Amino acid sequence: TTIIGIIYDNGVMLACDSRTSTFISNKCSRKINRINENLYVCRSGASAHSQKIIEIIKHYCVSMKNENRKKGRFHTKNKYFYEDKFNDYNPLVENVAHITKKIIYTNNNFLSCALIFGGYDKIKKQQLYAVNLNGSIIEKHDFAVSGSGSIYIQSYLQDKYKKFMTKKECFNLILNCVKYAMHNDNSSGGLIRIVNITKSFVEEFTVVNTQM
Amino acid sequence: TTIIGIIYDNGVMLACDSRTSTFISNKCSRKINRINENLYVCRSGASAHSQKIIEIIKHYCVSMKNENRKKGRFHTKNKYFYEDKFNDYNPLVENVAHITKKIIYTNNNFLSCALIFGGYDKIKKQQLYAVNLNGSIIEKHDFAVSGSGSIYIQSYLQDKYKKFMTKKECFNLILNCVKYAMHNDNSSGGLIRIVNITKSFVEEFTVVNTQMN
Amino acid sequence: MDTLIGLRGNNFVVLAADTYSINSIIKLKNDDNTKFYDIHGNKCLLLGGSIGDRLQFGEFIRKNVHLYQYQNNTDMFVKSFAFFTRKNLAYYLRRNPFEVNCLIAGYDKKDGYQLYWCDYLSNMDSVNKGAHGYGAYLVSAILDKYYHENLTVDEALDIFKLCFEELKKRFLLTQINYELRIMYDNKVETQYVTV
Amino acid sequence: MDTLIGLRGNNFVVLAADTYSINSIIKLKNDDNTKFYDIHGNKCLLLGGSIGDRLQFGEFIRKNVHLYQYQNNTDMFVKSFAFFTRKNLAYYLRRNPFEVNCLIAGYDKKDGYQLYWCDYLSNMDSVNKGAHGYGAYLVSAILDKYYHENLTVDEALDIFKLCFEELKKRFLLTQINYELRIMYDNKVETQYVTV
Amino acid sequence: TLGPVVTGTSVIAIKYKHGIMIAADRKASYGSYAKFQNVERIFKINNKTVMGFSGELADAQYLHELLTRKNINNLSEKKRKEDMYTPQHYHSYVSRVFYVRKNRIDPLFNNIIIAGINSQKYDNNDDNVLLYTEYKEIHKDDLYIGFVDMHGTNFCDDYITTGYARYFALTLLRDHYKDNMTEEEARILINECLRILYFRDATSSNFIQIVKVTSKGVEYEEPYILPC
Amino acid sequence: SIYNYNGGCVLGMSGSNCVAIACDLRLGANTFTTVSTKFSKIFKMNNNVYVGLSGLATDIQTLYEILRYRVNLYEVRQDAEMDVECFANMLSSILYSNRFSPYFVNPIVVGFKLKVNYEPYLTAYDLIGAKCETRDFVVNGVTSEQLFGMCESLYVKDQDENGLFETISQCLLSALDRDCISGWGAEVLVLTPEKIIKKKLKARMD
Amino acid sequence: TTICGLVCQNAVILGADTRATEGPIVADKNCSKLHYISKNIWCAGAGVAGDLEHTTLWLQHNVELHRLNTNTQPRVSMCVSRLTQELFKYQGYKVCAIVLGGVDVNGPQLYGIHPHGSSCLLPFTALGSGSLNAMAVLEAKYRDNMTIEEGKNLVCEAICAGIFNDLGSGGNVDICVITKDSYQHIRPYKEPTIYPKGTTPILSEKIEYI
Amino acid sequence: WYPYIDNGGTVIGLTGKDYVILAADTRLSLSYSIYTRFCPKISKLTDKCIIGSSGMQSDIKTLHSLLQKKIQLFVLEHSHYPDIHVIARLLCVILYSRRFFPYYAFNILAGVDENNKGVLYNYDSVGSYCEATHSCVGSGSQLILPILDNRVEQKNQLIKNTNFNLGDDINFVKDAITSATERDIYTGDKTLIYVIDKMGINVNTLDLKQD
Amino acid sequence: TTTLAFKFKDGIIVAVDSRASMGSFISSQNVEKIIEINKNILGTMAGGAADCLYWEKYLGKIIKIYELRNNEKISVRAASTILSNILYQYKGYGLCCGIILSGYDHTGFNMFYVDDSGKKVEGNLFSCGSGSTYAYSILDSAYDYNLNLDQAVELARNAIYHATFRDGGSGGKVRVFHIHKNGYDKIIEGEDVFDLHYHYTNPEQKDQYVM
Numbered sequence A: 001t002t003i004i005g006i007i008y009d010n011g012v013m014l015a016c017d018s019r020t021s022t023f024i025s026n027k028c029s030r031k032i033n034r035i036n037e038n039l040y041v042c043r044s045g046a047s048a049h050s051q052k053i054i055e056i057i058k059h060y061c062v063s064m065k066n067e068n069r070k071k072g073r074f075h076t077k078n079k080y081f082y083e084d085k086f087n088d089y090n091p092l093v094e095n096v097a098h099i100t101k102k103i104i105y106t107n108n109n110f111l112s113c114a115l116i117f118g119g120y121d122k123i124k125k126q127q128l129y130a131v132n133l134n135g136s137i138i139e140k141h142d143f144a145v146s147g148s149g150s151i152y153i154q155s156y157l158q159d160k161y162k163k164f165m166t167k168k169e170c171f172n173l174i175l176n177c178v179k180y181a182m183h184n185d186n187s188s189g190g191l192i193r194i195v196n197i198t199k200s201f202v203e204e205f206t207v208v209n210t211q212m
Numbered sequence B: 001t002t003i004i005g006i007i008y009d010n011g012v013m014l015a016c017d018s019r020t021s022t023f024i025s026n027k028c029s030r031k032i033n034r035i036n037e038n039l040y041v042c043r044s045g046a047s048a049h050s051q052k053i054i055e056i057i058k059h060y061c062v063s064m065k066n067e068n069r070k071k072g073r074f075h076t077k078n079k080y081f082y083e084d085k086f087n088d089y090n091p092l093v094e095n096v097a098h099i100t101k102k103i104i105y106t107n108n109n110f111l112s113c114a115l116i117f118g119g120y121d122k123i124k125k126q127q128l129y130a131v132n133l134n135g136s137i138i139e140k141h142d143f144a145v146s147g148s149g150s151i152y153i154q155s156y157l158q159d160k161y162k163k164f165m166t167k168k169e170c171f172n173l174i175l176n177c178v179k180y181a182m183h184n185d186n187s188s189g190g191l192i193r194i195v196n197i198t199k200s201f202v203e204e205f206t207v208v209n210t211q212m213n
Numbered sequence C, D: 001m002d003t004l005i006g007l008r009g010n011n012f013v014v015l016a017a018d019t020y021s022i023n024s025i026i027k028l029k030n031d032d033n034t035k036f037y038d039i040h041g042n043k044c045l046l047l048g049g050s051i052g053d054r055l056q057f058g059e060f061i062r063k064n065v066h067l068y069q070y071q072n073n074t075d076m077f078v079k080s081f082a083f084f085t086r087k088n089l090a091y092y093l094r095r096n097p098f099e100v101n102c103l104i105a106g107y108d109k110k111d112g113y114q115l116y117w118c119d120y121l122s123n124m125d126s127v128n129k130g131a132h133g134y135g136a137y138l139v140s141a142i143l144d145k146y147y148h149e150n151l152t153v154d155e156a157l158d159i160f161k162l163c164f165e166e167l168k169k170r171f172l173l174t175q176i177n178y179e180l181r182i183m184y185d186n187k188v189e190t191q192y193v194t195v
Numbered sequence E: 001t002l003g004p005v006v007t008g009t010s011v012i013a014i015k016y017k018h019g020i021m022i023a024a025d026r027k028a029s030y031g032s033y034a035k036f037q038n039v040e041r042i043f044k045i046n047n048k049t050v051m052g053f054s055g056e057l058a059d060a061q062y063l064h065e066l067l068t069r070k071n072i073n074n075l076s077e078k079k080r081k082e083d084m085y086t087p088q089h090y091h092s093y094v095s096r097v098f099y100v101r102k103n104r105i106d107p108l109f110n111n112i113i114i115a116g117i118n119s120q121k122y123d124n125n126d127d128n129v130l131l132y133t134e135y136k137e138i139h140k141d142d143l144y145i146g147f148v149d150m151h152g153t154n155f156c157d158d159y160i161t162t163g164y165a166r167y168f169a170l171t172l173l174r175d176h177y178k179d180n181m182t183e184e185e186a187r188i189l190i191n192e193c194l195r196i197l198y199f200r201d202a203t204s205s206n207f208i209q210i211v212k213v214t215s216k217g218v219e220y221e222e223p224y225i226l227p228c
Numbered sequence F: 001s002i003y004n005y006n007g008g009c010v011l012g013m014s015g016s017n018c019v020a021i022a023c024d025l026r027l028g029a030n031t032f033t034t035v036s037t038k039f040s041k042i043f044k045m046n047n048n049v050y051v052g053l054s055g056l057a058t059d060i061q062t063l064y065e066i067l068r069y070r071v072n073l074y075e076v077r078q079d080a081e082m083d084v085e086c087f088a089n090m091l092s093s094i095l096y097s098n099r100f101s102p103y104f105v106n107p108i109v110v111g112f113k114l115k116v117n118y119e120p121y122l123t124a125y126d127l128i129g130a131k132c133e134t135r136d137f138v139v140n141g142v143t144s145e146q147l148f149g150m151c152e153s154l155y156v157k158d159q160d161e162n163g164l165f166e167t168i169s170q171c172l173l174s175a176l177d178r179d180c181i182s183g184w185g186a187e188v189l190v191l192t193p194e195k196i197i198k199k200k201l202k203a204r205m206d
Numbered sequence G: 001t002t003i004c005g006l007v008c009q010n011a012v013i014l015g016a017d018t019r020a021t022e023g024p025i026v027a028d029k030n031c032s033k034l035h036y037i038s039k040n041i042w043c044a045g046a047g048v049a050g051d052l053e054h055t056t057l058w059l060q061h062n063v064e065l066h067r068l069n070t071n072t073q074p075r076v077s078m079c080v081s082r083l084t085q086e087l088f089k090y091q092g093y094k095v096c097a098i099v100l101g102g103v104d105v106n107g108p109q110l111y112g113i114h115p116h117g118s119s120c121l122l123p124f125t126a127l128g129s130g131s132l133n134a135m136a137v138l139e140a141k142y143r144d145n146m147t148i149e150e151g152k153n154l155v156c157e158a159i160c161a162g163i164f165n166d167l168g169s170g171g172n173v174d175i176c177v178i179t180k181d182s183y184q185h186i187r188p189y190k191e192p193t194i195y196p197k198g199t200t201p202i203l204s205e206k207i208e209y210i
Numbered sequence H: 001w002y003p004y005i006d007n008g009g010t011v012i013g014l015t016g017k018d019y020v021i022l023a024a025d026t027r028l029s030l031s032y033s034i035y036t037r038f039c040p041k042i043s044k045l046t047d048k049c050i051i052g053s054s055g056m057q058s059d060i061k062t063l064h065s066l067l068q069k070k071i072q073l074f075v076l077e078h079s080h081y082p083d084i085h086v087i088a089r090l091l092c093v094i095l096y097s098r099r100f101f102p103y104y105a106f107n108i109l110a111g112v113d114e115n116n117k118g119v120l121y122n123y124d125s126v127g128s129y130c131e132a133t134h135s136c137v138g139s140g141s142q143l144i145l146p147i148l149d150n151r152v153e154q155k156n157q158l159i160k161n162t163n164f165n166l167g168d169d170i171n172f173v174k175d176a177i178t179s180a181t182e183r184d185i186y187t188g189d190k191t192l193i194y195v196i197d198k199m200g201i202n203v204n205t206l207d208l209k210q211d
Numbered sequence I: 001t002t003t004l005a006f007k008f009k010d011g012i013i014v015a016v017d018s019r020a021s022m023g024s025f026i027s028s029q030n031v032e033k034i035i036e037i038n039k040n041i042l043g044t045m046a047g048g049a050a051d052c053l054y055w056e057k058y059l060g061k062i063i064k065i066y067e068l069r070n071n072e073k074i075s076v077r078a079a080s081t082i083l084s085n086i087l088y089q090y091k092g093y094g095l096c097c098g099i100i101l102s103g104y105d106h107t108g109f110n111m112f113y114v115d116d117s118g119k120k121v122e123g124n125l126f127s128c129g130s131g132s133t134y135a136y137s138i139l140d141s142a143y144d145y146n147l148n149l150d151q152a153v154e155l156a157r158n159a160i161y162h163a164t165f166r167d168g169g170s171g172g173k174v175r176v177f178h179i180h181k182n183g184y185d186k187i188i189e190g191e192d193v194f195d196l197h198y199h200y201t202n203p204e205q206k207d208q209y210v211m
């Protein structure tokens, strides 16, 4: 697996491959799961465990979003905008990431999964949180990478990164990173899925190319 | 650990770090060993296995060089020139690499070392070979990397490589590769040792540098 | 190491067992009373294996059967007693196994003189002849040879004597002291045998 | 399971052993002859443990000692016999150990009536009284209590009889048949004792 | 070898009208890591015999050196072309080597294919054997494709797949293979099998090497990338 | 294994308006000692349902008692006979309820499905409770392979009661002669809608 | 076993073989592996037979209860969620690799649920011992858009390949076509002596008339 | 590394007064996967003897080749072909030679002896053997052997019919291997039937269920 | 298995079953367990069949070579010693043999028990195999030295029948040989225990026998 998150000047871009398992059991798996309209998460490790925490965090995020509502009135590419224009009631990425940390930490004895949460928020702007195997959260203000393939792109991403990257060059960097990881790693392959999260609109990209 | 060998125009550059072992037992270790004046070798894996096969191969190379001689008359860096100007009797790199492969394969039940042989000779010009854990040889016409720290620089080296690199840019590439591997890997550290092998002269560079970004 | 033998006929049912209380590499007693458990209403439950499991299981079955017979004011049938014992021993099989090998015996107006063989796994069946222990190996075939349906009490006692002599002669644990338990003519009797 | 007993003195050295040939959960024999390995020249090597190791080691030692005594035309000393046996048993300890427990006994004009205790690990020392097997747990203190330096042959035989009665009464292998050796008055004698 | 480290993936081999066609991808994997992707996995034993492997690379190299030494040993003791060894002889040698290694509980961690032409009537190639520097229709009974197993189990068929292909390509072959197939039909069938293997096998790659054992000897076609 | 301790096997076949169930008569002990030669392994649930239990004898007895309890409860509550398929599914559910602490039994259910058309009904399970509704014959026990071979060798569709009896009896006896831990007599039990015939075969008692 | 699923134009086609072996020995030669969950949802199973059968029965009855309560068409995602939540609770000790298929308001939907409780929406799936042969034939011959008949032929070919190339798979071929309006099930889709009287001795005999 | 595998298949053998039949399937399979659909198990030793066997294929092939080599050396040295009994004792000794790392091969040695009497010899891995009228080895053997015991000896039948001849015995063996492929997953594909009379060997073939 | 030898007034009786089983599956009910070592010495097989057959034939070879070298027949004691030493040489290799060598020599009628562990026990009433305890129970309960030949023959047959009856692993056919001064006789070459059961314990044959 090669899951990667990279902050740029106006949002955060997450990226993943599609190859599940010597036998390639599946080759169209959607690793980047939509927790909320402003918050996504990349998964690595055991698929069953990852799906379990993903459904639980969807449930918790729906409960939080219902809680956050205040009384009374105020004030192949895909793309859409947020129903919550001003982020009046969307849960924070911080809160979702830490409840995920607590969920994974309470069951260390058998859970084996690493997550990369990424989104946008009115308080902290764009976010990136890496939750490790034992359930330890670290905020990665520049970029986070995880999976078996991520080992082959640490120096590449570290060398190519800049502080305030444009959308085009950040897209090229993350695409080339996932392509290199797929080229070097047998366990990662298939089509590349990228999710760009900004202040107003989320957009989804699919790419069906690989290295030389 | 990080051991790298990169071929460039009229030459081959090998490079290594110095760290040995959670507790750093040693921090100035010569992993690049001089088998012959035209042939060097980078070590990885257990140090005892590496040292013993490398000194055995030095003994075998001395025997080969003695038998290769013909009868009668014919015709902080450091730099050396070859005593054999025309390569009349220096053994070929492939011969030494293949007898090393046989040595490691015959005793692969317990030997757990991986080697990168790098050299020059008049037949095949500059040469790189990689002897793997079980004792399998592959000739890497572009570059070879091994060690626990090499996994962090596969894409970096693959992206930065060109066919006919100049000496300066090849030196910068291999130096930055070993630096990045040391930065990412706990098992590798210390000063960088580089060995540049050419048709006529060998150079041995020592570099002290860290990573800032 | 605990040898048990039992024999059922048309007008008798007899039991026999070695009177050896064993502990490690020594014999605690040559008059062990931990094996037989006589129960009111002409019933007997004969156990082998560990002394502790013998005492606990035998007293549990004895007091439960007596509780039944005093609550309901009647003597329990021997078949009911045997299957009650098997159900109780099977209930502890998967949680706290009693390592006890049971020979149930009794007299009933419903079904004559009954005998039931049962093992530590609670695998029970009615039999005309049964035995338990490593001595069973050496006595059971003798019970095949000399058994016929119309035996008398003396002939059965002679068969048991031959079994005891076989256990003395051939068995590794040369057992020589045995206690019997006869049931015939609406009676229960005890005999001790030295051969 | 194989009991051996030996008792020294100034006018005698006596040995005794159960006559049980055993396999699995049965006695092959009550008159086993596989234990005593009397040598020419007032010497005996009483063994315990496996029957096969007993036969192999005892015959090896006996034929080697006879080879010595015919090559050199003299009687071997009992101390020499005991230490030769110990060295030979020790040589196989790490390679292919004989599981044999040794009581050497004999008479010399040099050293008088001698007895040596030794085990499967080849740890040897001379003794005034020795025993082997689990029966050694039960027939050791009886030898300690009733032994005195000036015993006669009948008193020693009485002590051995008390040891045999102890083995019958308390040891779970109720051993009743025993064979003896009596080295006294410059003559070797054999006896058999029941119960 | 105590077990595999740098492992080679499957090989496919079929008979066709003019001879043998054997295909292997040029990838050798170091665990779950494509460390090498230009590895020659099919070896030329002699002018009418080639070998392929799937398993540990060091063991395959050792076996290749053994068979090479056997080939020069044969060539030294040669007077006529009929003295040359057919693929049957090399297959029997590899089977005996694997059986003897299996008796000691010390195998070569490999599955081997030996293939080629089992007769000399179709050409005079081995009249003057050179080592350092239209086709004819060959009958199926004069061709040879062998299999040898790690336990020494061995056999022959009109089409052999070794390794992960045994479940994927073999099925397709068992539907699509037919006697007297042209070069184009064999090529497209092998390409389809390798495409399926590439899409549904992690350790395989799309960089293929095809070798033809034909009346004009062994021919290593230039390697190519499978389209799509 | 646990099944080798007691041994034994059960068999069932169908015919034209008849259906047979057969079993051996032995309680084993430690895989080689025969302690009883009447340990019947076939039990009657109702007039149109029979069960043949093979495996561990204690688990056989407990499963028979539990099934008798449930069947009698169903019959007194509903005041009618049980359909054979209902008892089959009840047995499957009871077996699966002990999924991780199984009863080591491999039962078969043999009965007549009523409608009145008396169709045969044969089912076989394992300890987990995986059914296999089979139309010709059902086999369970340690002698399963020999019984399967004999049954496919000698089965003929649509036999009367007599030929069904000789076929199933020959199958059982030949299968039991090739098993060490199963034999010592054999019960055969042929059901028809009007009557029922149970016989003890003259077998090899060794 | 070869269980197989694929998705056609407004439909899902499942197929399976009819073999059940207790080790080397074939027990049932015409077993049934396609299970009814709902009128618009079907499945096929591989792994432990008892866990498959009882999990499928539990899922079918839970789906029917939910259908009675909500009074709407059952959903494929509901069955997937219930199955995955049940399978993870036992932590892979419920060995059930199940290919689910159905049609609902969100169109056709085929899922492959694995025994540890992970699912994947797919265009086609194969599972069982003979899964690789069926996967090979499917990847060879499957296309982006096809009809009911083409998908039926493809599923039959894949199951036949699994039958011929695998020893744990054999017998006939069954398929089920699940459409929004109704389902349609074919069990046999493909389908690729007398002893004398008194010969057997007896010890006793007795007849009692019921 | 465990050095033993089972390649499956079955080998049935039957005798009459003056003939022997030996059927064997030609399937070869590792574990729920078919190596090939034609791998014969029966081999010819002399003009009046054959050996069939089931187990690991490499052991079977090496054993059969070694036995053929030894019999040919016997013929070259002692100047006469060996009877089935001589080859039987020779096979016993060869199998016992590897007693502490046994061949994983169960064999049936079929032939017709000096007296024109059909003889079989069934074997185990370590060389125990005996004469028999009928025998079977391989994966299916526990299926076929009760059938042969019922048909041939007829222990449990009160009225018997011991009227056997070559054609009915061939049909019986064909039915036996048919049931074997029916209920054994490792038995299938073509089967080869060898018939030895006093004249010599004759081989027939029969297709079975490809599954 | 059940083998049972015993001296009596007019020589020795040896008695064996013929069953042979691979675990639960019955392999053959026609195995020859009483092996003729030489003209006077007999042996009997228990445990591993291959080891017993091979080493008893090897002992026969050694005895023949010795008797040809020295020109006088060997004793039971010497054959027992040679077999015991040969079997003890393979200690730690996993052999499984239980043998009862009985015979006549110039010392008289002799009987010894040997096994793979290296025993050489000497007695007058021996029994080996799975059903050895049952045969011991029958033999010791009725053995008498002054029995006639027929009385001791029926005693041996009854003991073997009871051993086969109780023991799952013993059965098939009973074979009873008698050794005398001038050689030996096969008094019962083979006899099904089916008839023994329905003759001894269940003669009425009106109901199933209950134990």
Ligand SMILES: CCONC(=O)N1CCC[C@H](C(=O)N[C@@H](C)c2nc(-c3ccc(C#N)cc3)cs2)C1
Binding pocket: H006, H054, H055, H056, H105, H106, H122, H123, H124, H128, H129, H130, H134, H135, H136, H137, H138, H139, H141, H142, I020, I022, I025, I026, I027, I028, I031, I032, I049
């Ligand atoms: C991988 C091999 O496949 N599995 C196989 O082949 N099996 C296992 C299942 C039972 C079969 C069986 O028992 N077959 C009968 C005909 C045989 N009997 C003997 C035999 C040998 C010596 C004596 C003596 N003395 C007695 C019998 C050898 S084979 C043999």
